[PDB]
Amino acid sequence: HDRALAFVGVLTQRYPLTQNAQRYTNPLVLGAAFGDFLNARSIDIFLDRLFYGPTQESPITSITKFPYQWTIDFNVTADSVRTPAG
Amino acid sequence: PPGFLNPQLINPQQAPLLRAFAEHIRANWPQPSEFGYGSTLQGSANLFI
Questions:
Q1: Number of CB pairs < 8 Å for A and B?
Q2: A24 Cβ under 8 Å from any chain B Cβ
């Protein structure tokens, strides 16, 4: 309950709700970002790419726009993403 | 590089400095010009220009 509320505060300090309620979150990015957060690891890199337009691409292809090692546990190539299973 | 050809291919939030640098180059690199010389009373010797 502590971590959940804190994570909400971060998500809302950026992206004010009234301007972003309609946007769709990328489940992959959301899962990775949340997992790092309660692992007491910084998550700033993920917040820039929390959303995606489902009518224009998949949650995968939305990520492959940035083909490089985002972080030590989240590595994405031009065609694929590697991460530990939750 | 295509990104150099079109700086819009570089995400600002992800690579700010590179995007700015490309736009700076594309905006401030000087424009070439031309001017005459010599005398019309003589041959030109120019090939392309």
A1: 5
A2: no
